[PDB]
Nucleic acid binder design. Structure first.
Length: 183
DNA sequence: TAGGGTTAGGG
């Protein structure tokens, strides 16, 4: 079977009136849910405005994501691949971004190498293999931009990515200022 | 719009 983490979706922006039952009624349209829950304030019992839905298979998760936009209880919500508690500790881990930072790529890496691995996740809009300003030397990293934030999410929730024959690290791209705030 | 009494012992 597939790991519970990859079979789960974070549902943000829920109407304060959405309950486990109404959330389930909506999302069961795309598959068998093994878990469905609205997070609430431990004390006031009030809804925190987000919940989680888990399907029996990742294929059903993909169907749900392909069904966006989603409107639950009259409110447009935002379904996202669930980022593990461990990974949610990283700065910007929950940001909606369309660009990924690809690190540790060999110096002879070319755009076709990046496409052969990344296109499977979604439409690529931009690819930029970074080089040094002045020497023209390859720097060992690149940026890839997609047309859907879910393409980036589907990627970053995975541990390994093979480009030009070897593994490379992939993370959501952070702005110059985001980088500065994180360190 | 980031998790539900869900994260370092004791040899």
């Amino acid at each position: 079977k597939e790991p519970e983490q990859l079979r789960k979706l974070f549902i943000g922006g829920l109407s304060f009136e959405t309950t486990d039952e109404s959330l389930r009624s909506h999302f069961e349209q795309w598959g068998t849910l093994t878990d469905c829950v609205v997070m609430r304030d431990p004390n006031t019992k009030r809804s925190r405005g987000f919940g989680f839905v888990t399907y029996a298979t990742v294929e059903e998760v993909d169907a749900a994501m392909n069904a966006r936009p989603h409107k639950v209880d009259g409110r447009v919500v935002e379904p996202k691949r669930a980022v593990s508690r461990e990974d949610s500790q990283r700065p910007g881990a929950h940001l909606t971004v369309k660009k990924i930072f690809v690190g540790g790529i060999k110096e002879d890496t070319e755009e076709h190498h990046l496409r052969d691995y990344f296109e499977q996740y979604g439409k690529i809009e931009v690819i930029e293999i970074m080089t040094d300003r002045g020497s023209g030397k390859k720097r060992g990293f690149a940026f890839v931009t997609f047309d859907d934030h879910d393409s980036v999410d589907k990627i970053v929730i995975q541990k390994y990515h093979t480009v030009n024959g070897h593994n490379c690290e992939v993370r959501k791209a952070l702005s110059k200022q985001e980088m500065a705030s994180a360190s």
